[PDB]
Design a protein around this ligand. Structure first.
Ligand SMILES: NC(=O)C1(CNc2ncnc3[nH]c4cc(Br)ccc4c23)CC1
Ligand SMILES: [Cl-]
Length: 167
């Protein structure tokens, strides 16, 4: 039993809710919140901009030190950093950005990072400003993630479409 509330169960291990991931993280304080990161950990907009704003820019400060030491992530890759006031840990995961021409096949590799964590609060990777079809992202999530994932979808209209079209 965990503290996530109001989710629709899609499969054995995948759950979904119309929610602001920032507000959900602040309420649940999950062990792991997933950020929709880019390779530079520049948290300017979308989910990343919102999460970073909620940390009062502490996420960005920590991220800049990480990049200065380690260099950029790979598309499809991840790193574990602090969750600040939102979670114990933040798993920064880089899905392909279609608006940059990146290979959508890397979306499966991106979701594989979730399997290193028993339970996660997450957005749909490569959705939103990353330009992928969220219906496809949900399909890849369900077919790739084996650990327990609680998906927060900000847009109510999109949430209803994701549920109603789910196979
Ligand atoms: N834009 C979308 O509808 C999707 C991706 N964005 C988010 N997904 C889940 N929680 C989120 N909290 C946010 C807060 C701010 Br401010 C901006 C964006 C998001 C966000 C669901 C596809
Ligand atoms: Cl977004």
């Amino acid at each position: 039993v965990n503290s996530f509330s109001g989710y629709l169960k899609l499969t054995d291990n995948v759950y979904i809710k119309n929610a602001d991931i920032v507000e959900e993280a602040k309420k649940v304080k999950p062990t792991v919140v997933v950020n929709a990161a880019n390779v530079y950990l520049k948290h300017g907009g979308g989910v990343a901009g919102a999460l970073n704003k909620a940390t009062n820019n502490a996420m960005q400060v920590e991220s800049d030190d990480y990049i200065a030491t380690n260099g950029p992530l790979k598309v499809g890759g991840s790193c574990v950093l602090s969750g600040h006031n939102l979670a114990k840990h933040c798993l920064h995961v880089v899905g392909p950005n279609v608006n940059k021409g990146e290979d959508i096949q890397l979306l499966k590799s991106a979701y594989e990072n979730f399997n290193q964590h028993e339970v996660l609060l997450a957005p749909l990777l490569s959705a939103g400003i990353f330009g992928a079809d969220p219906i496809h992202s949900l399909r890849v999530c369900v077919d790739t993630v084996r650990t327990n994932v609680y998906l927060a979808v900000f847009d109510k209209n999109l949430y209803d479409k994701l549920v109603s079209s789910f196979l």
